[PDB]
Amino acid sequence: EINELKEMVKDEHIYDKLVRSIAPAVFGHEAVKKGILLQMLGGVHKSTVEGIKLRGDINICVVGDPSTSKSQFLKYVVGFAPRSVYTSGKASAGLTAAVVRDEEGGDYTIEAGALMLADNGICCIDEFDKMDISDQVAIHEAMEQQTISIAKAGIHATLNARTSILAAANPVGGRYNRKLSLRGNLNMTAPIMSRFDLFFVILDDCNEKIDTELASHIVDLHMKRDEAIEPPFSAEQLRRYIKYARTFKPILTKEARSYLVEKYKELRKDDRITVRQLESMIRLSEAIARANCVDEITPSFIAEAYDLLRQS
Amino acid sequence: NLNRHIRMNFETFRSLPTLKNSIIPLVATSKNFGSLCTAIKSCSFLDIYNKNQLSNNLTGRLQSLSDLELAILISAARVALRAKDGSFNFNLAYAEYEKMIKAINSRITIKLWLKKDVKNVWENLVQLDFFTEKSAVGLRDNATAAFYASNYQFQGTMIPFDLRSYQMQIILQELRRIIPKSNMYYSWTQL
């Protein structure tokens, strides 16, 4: 196991097979695969110089037109990640850990539900826009501070729940129009729109050269265990690689901070963008440092994250 | 082939002096006897002739433009698809153009031009008739109707250059069929 891990950390083309091996059943969409691969492992959350914990996790949300392969990732995470709870979203307090009574003392206990079931994992919510207002403000109360609060029968109890929301949303009309902004098309309020590190917009049209390849891949997949789907390496070493990169704990330098202030100015020159998107790209930097297994981070690997933010 | 190409003239024109026009250079371009007989045997000159009669109505207008002039017009239709009448200002073009540019570099080195220079490219585009003014009756029929339009002081000149509401001559969806896929802006023809 360590003979496979030391062989896999000494090469140079690991990340390029990792972005095409995190979802081998999906044709195209390297940016969505990049965010899904960097959304499994987080970083630098630890402790603030004062005494309060910060949001060191990566929030990933996918949007686009109907009949795409964006739910396939949703079906992959839950079939591969052990710390992964999937919910239908439309058919959903439960999300933010509901309260149920016990008759001994007529006392309450807090069921995790979708929100607290996973620990250092990915909670994936399909159909995020057909949910109500109560579970979405419970998600917002669970997201401002990495904790969830339950107030019932006179007692108040809050607890540390760490989750990475994988939100699958759709527009109000389904078809994504390039006419306006993301806010009027997503149809949800600003606060619940905030604390999200990366948005993935997928638009489709008639482009025959990649479309014929996609349809051929779909009809070639429809057979008994085809080799077409096959990745460059299996998940057997990828699980221990995820765990080995998880126990690494890397840190930033001065050149990265000097390039980061100019990158935040470049992201704010496009203008909403505030401190939360800066925190999202800071948290994605140590995740890509852990994925490439480099300790002290250089700004050239943060340049790919800058290009990923520019691509969105 | 001569009998083949006469069939085409029967189809679209069905008029003899159109075809009669084509033969006049074909029989004067020969210099010896035997070349002329091959010319009416080949009729390849009729291809070159129908090439030249076609070469700058609308398509060869489009093929004979540089990289920027395509890129302005490609943005000019993607604004034009949004509004209901299809009209679009110069600021909506430029803004759209800038947004389009802010996508090519981020997916990879292309000189984004200024404001003060696109006007020089915008001048040729309106006199290449790829755009029209919104309410502009082009040619009057007779003299005294044109003379009644000359005395009339206009309002569109009284709003500035960058706000004359220019509309579209060549629609966005038809650009995809003519622009080859080898060009980088082919992803922008379709929305």
Q: Within 13 Å and on the Cβ side, how many CA atoms surround B108?
A: 8
Tokens of B120: 């020089």
Q: Chain A contacts of B95, Cβ < 8 Å?
A: none
Residues contacting residue A238 through CB under 8 Å, at least 6 positions apart: A18, A21
Interface membership of A203 toward B (CB under 8 Å): yes
Q: How many CB atoms lie within 10 A of CB B112?
A: 10
Cβ separation of A310 and B106 shorter than 8 Å?
A: yes
Q: Which of A179, A205, A209 sits opposite B82 (nearest CB)?
A: A179
CB A83 within 8 A of CB A119: yes
Measured between CA atoms, how close is B99 to chain A, in angstroms? 10
Measured between CA atoms, how close is A269 to chain B, in angstroms? 12
Q: How far is CA A185 from CA A62, A171, A190, A194, B151, in A?
A: 13, 6, 12, 15, 49
Give residue B102's Cα distance to chain centre.
Answer: 27
The string of DSSP letters for chain A reads -HHHHHHHSSSS-HHHHHSSSS-TT--S-HHHHHHHHTTSS----S--SSS--------EEEEE-SS-SHHHHHHHHHHH-SSEEEE-STT---TT-EEEEETTTTEEEEE-HHHHS-SSEEEEES-GGGS-SHHHHHHHHHHHTT-EEEEETTEEEEE---EEEEEE---SSSS--TTS-HHHHHTS-HHHHSS--EEEEE-----HHHHHHHHHHHHHHSSSS-SSS--SS-STTHHHHHHHHHT------HHHHHHHHHHHHHHHTT---SHHHHHHHHHHHHHHHHHTT-SSPPHHHHHHHHHHHHH-
Experimental approach taken: cryo-EM
Torsion of CA A236, A238, A239, A243, to 10 degrees: 140
Measured between CA atoms, how close is B106 to chain A, in angstroms? 5
| Domains of chain A: total | 1
Q: Within 13 Å and on the Cβ side, how many CA atoms surround A28?
A: 15
Range of the domain at A28: 1-312
CA–CA separation, A64 and A208 (whole Å): 20
A45 φ/ψ sector (left φ>0, alpha ψ -120 to 50, else beta): alpha
Tokens of A15: 């990340």
CA–CA separation, A197 and A194 (whole Å): 8
Measured between CA atoms, how close is B76 to chain A, in angstroms? 14
Feature table: binding site of A for ATP: 64-71
Residue with tokens 């949703």: A74
Measured in angstroms, the resolution is: 10.0
Residues contacting residue A114 through CB under 8 Å, at least 6 positions apart: A85, A87, A92, A94, A95, A123, A125
Cβ separation of A307 and B106 shorter than 8 Å?
A: yes
Cβ separation of A179 and B107 shorter than 8 Å?
A: no
Q: How far is CA B111 from CA A284, B64, B75, B98, B119, in A?
A: 30, 21, 16, 11, 16
CATH number of the domain to which A89 belongs: 3.40.50.300
Q: Chain A contacts of B105, Cβ < 8 Å?
A: 310
Q: How far is CA A296 from CA A246, A247, A290, A300, in A?
A: 15, 15, 10, 12
Q: Which of B78, B107, B190 sits opposite A205 (nearest CB)?
A: B190
CA–CA separation, A297 and A303 (whole Å): 11
Chain A residue with Cα closest to B98: A270
Quote the radius of gyration of chain B (alpha carbons, Å): 23
Residues composing chain B: 191
How buried is residue B176: exposed, middle or buried, by Cβ count under 10 Å (0-12/13-18/19+)? middle
CA–CA separation, B96 and B75 (whole Å): 6
Interface membership of B173 toward A (CB under 8 Å): no
Interface membership of B99 toward A (CB under 8 Å): no
Interface membership of B107 toward A (CB under 8 Å): yes
Interface membership of A212 toward B (CB under 8 Å): no
CA–CA separation, A149 and A116 (whole Å): 11
How buried is residue A68: exposed, middle or buried, by Cβ count under 10 Å (0-12/13-18/19+)? middle
CA–CA separation, A100 and B142 (whole Å): 88
Residues contacting residue B112 through CB under 8 Å, at least 6 positions apart: B98, B101
Q: How far is CA A289 from CA A183, A254, A286, A305, in A?
A: 32, 16, 5, 11
Cβ separation of A311 and B107 shorter than 8 Å?
A: yes
CB A160 within 8 A of CB A105: no
The string of DSSP letters for chain B reads -HHHHHHHHHHTT--HHHHHHHHHHHHHS--SHHHHHHHHHH-HHHHHHHHHTTTTSSHHHHHT--HHHHHHHHHHHHHHTTSSS--B-HHHHHHHHHHHHHHHTTT-------STTHHHHHHHHHTTTSEEETT-----SSHHHHHHHHSS--STTTS-GGGS-EEESS-HHHHHHHS-TTSTTHHHH--
CA–CA separation, B101 and B111 (whole Å): 9
Output phi, psi for A255, to 5 deg. Answer: -70, -35
